[PDB]
């Protein structure tokens, strides 16, 4: 059985949750309190969350969790080159996310607008171009078939759209793509409920 | 054929160089000097390096490159769980590298000492303990069988020794582990010659 342990925010665990929910995989979504964290901190290999318990097995590190799940549930591509392609795209999503979190925790007042104007369009052009190399950008990252990295890019697009409602206005492939991921039947309800419960994107309440 | 493009520093490409040298895999080590970089930036999927061409296939992202090499050259463990363990460990190593490089680039004068004292020992103790879970940490991360992550951890330990020569003194498993990686027939003439030429660890010359 699965138990995902993280803080009660989207942050680094959300794409993991998205994968499981969409694919109908039962898991315990274990959102801890700020207050209980200090006493569990030492239970985890690097003293951080997220953690996925697969049976007795402790799996920390969000990337290792995603790639493990990809392999257990056939969301890792159809061959060596596709697996490599999705990992490369996944890593570029995470690189954008590191720039995003930096501005959010460290410089929201002073760097939000330069982020939106000078950094984000440059970084979205890279995803737009890469997405267009499969099925002309009209289906998933690999074209015909969905893979773990589709849930990772969706979350990243979605939180950037919260930050800037017009971020995808000039990237038609990414825009239509976000919209196809959002209306997946396995997700439509979860994202509605998440939306109305006002689940924070980040630990400091800014987004 | 393989061709590895990166700046003429260790930095993010070094673990990939070590994997290939050690294993006897022929590659072109394309060290591009900084002056020529704006001439080629737009040629790569994310406008960054390192890049590995495997035949005609462009592979950016150091992590995607590593795991690609792992699957292709039987350096990714013997089963699912093992693959997940080394991925977990590798991601631990990159997290310390992110702490390391922020200090190097942004705060070498002011934070080098406190990092050596307060941060670095806590982070290494995490590696010491995880290494112990397999074969009492007496061999490689997975036991008797070497894998891609050994090369990543080796590099991260080695550079940290250049920064503080005493950083492994209180970590018996990691100390011995570093020496065991350094003495591999495959990497030692390489490490001798690398040490001869005083190849910079980082792009800003600090180490
Ligand atoms: N590289 C890790 C990062 C994990 C991480 O940064 N976790 C933070 C939350 S964003 C945490 O657990 N903080 C609590 C603490 O370390 O005391 C991953 O991708 O899983
Ligand atoms: N996450 C990427 C990061 C690559 C990266 O940051 N590369 C920088 C230098 S270490 C670069 O190639 N060029 C800076 C630039 O032109 O933007 C990876 O792991 O490969």
UniProtKB/TrEMBL annotation, chains A, B:
Binding annotation for glutathione: 37, 41, 49, 62, 94
Transmembrane intervals: none
InterPro entries referenced in this protein's UniProt entry, alphabetically: Glutathione-S-Trfase_C-like (IPR010987), Glutathione-S-Trfase_C_sf (IPR036282), Glutathione_S-Trfase (IPR040079), Glutathione_S-Trfase_N (IPR004045), GST_C (IPR004046), GST_pi (IPR003082), GST_superfamily (IPR050213), Thioredoxin-like_sf (IPR036249)
CDD domains, per the entry: GST_C_Pi, GST_N_Pi
Family label: Belongs to the GST superfamily. Pi family.
Domain GST N-terminal positions: 1-77
Enzyme Commission designation: 2.5.1.18
Source taxon at top rank: Eukaryota
Gene Ontology MF terms: glutathione transferase activity
GO biological process per UniProt: glutathione metabolic process
Boundaries of every GST C-terminal domain copy: 79-201
CC per GO annotation: cytosol
Keywords, alphabetical: Transferase
Catalytic activities: RX + glutathione = an S-substituted glutathione + a halide anion + H(+)
Protein's UniProt name: Glutathione S-transferase
Organism from which the protein derives: Wuchereria bancrofti
Complexes and interactors: Homodimer.
Function: Conjugation of reduced glutathione to a wide number of exogenous and endogenous hydrophobic electrophiles.
PROSITE patterns for the chain: GST_CTER, GST_NTER
